[PDB]
DNA sequence: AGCGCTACCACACCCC
DNA sequence: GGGTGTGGTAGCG
């Protein structure tokens with residue numbers, strides 16, 4: 001109840017035959033989610049970075065299908081982000097990154113593989129869920145200085161109550177590595193200034209977290225997220241949709257497969 | 270006209 | 286000297 005108060009109190013201050021199409025832009029994030037409620041269509045909220053170098057964002061509301069239609073060519077709608085709605089069920093995902101200069105002998109492949117091998121073990125012990133690297137969409141946005149990878153888990157009929165509970169799960173199973181201010185040593189890496197922190201970014205599990213979309217780049221640079229070469233997740237091939245659209249749907253954190261046997265995973269801190 | 274939030278420091282308090 | 290709860294802005298993500 002304390003969260004919805006900050007949203008309502010910020011709102012009072014902020015105010016002081018064509019084919020079926022839905023394409024609404026909103027200056028405020030709250031306005032977008034309000035429209036989603038009074039919509040009835042399977043619509044979702046995206047965030048676009050404005051030409052301003054800062055993180056100033058505008059919020060687009062439309063379906064996953066229509067969005068990809070005006071987005072697949074990559075001539076327009078660059079620097080887009082998925083708004084992971086709070087309280088909404090979502091997939092297990094990761095934001096992985098370390099500074100290459102400050103970490104000479106850190107192999108990016110073995111680190112992500114060992115990380116997956118560990119989380120999969122954790123999913124088995126705590127929740128009985130079983131999966132392997134074959135269920136992990138591996139994306140890359142690395143440069144010559146930053147090894148940047150996004151992992152989106154594609155679990156069979158499983159999801160988390162929301163992204164906050166995802167964070168409680170990772171802080172829990174990554175506590176052995178958090179103590180290093182289960183041999184989770186490969187997680188520790190030297191940051192920008194040689195300070196030792198974790199290979200896993202635990203700051204992407206907040207309410208209404210933006211998350212850069214598949215084939216999008218930050219407004220600054222020009223390196224877009226793309227599927228790695230060692231990725232082991234392959235969507236099912238369908239004749240009614242393109243393979244790129246399959247990866248796009250898989251990459252969406254808040255696009256949980258509709259299933260009549262869905263298990264919702266929770267985790268309190 | 271983005272939206273969330275904690276890492277950090279400062280202070281106030283208590284304890285034998 | 287240690288230890289614990291409270292503000293409150295700067296700054297990351």
Ligand SMILES: Nc1ncnc2c1ncn2[C@H]1C[C@H](O)[C@@H](COP(=O)(O)OP(=O)(O)OP(=O)(O)O)O1
Nearest residue numbers: 055081095097141142146148204210211212218298
């Ligand atoms: N100023 C911001 N405002 C809102 N959301 C942000 C902001 N900065 C980062 N985020 C969100 C979107 C990002 O996809 C998410 C992860 O942060 P970040 O690591 O800086 O971007 P990224 O991981 O997608 O690219 P990369 O790590 O390769 O630089 O946090």
Ligand SMILES: [Ca+2]
Nearest residue numbers: 095096097148
């Ligand atoms: Ca990142």
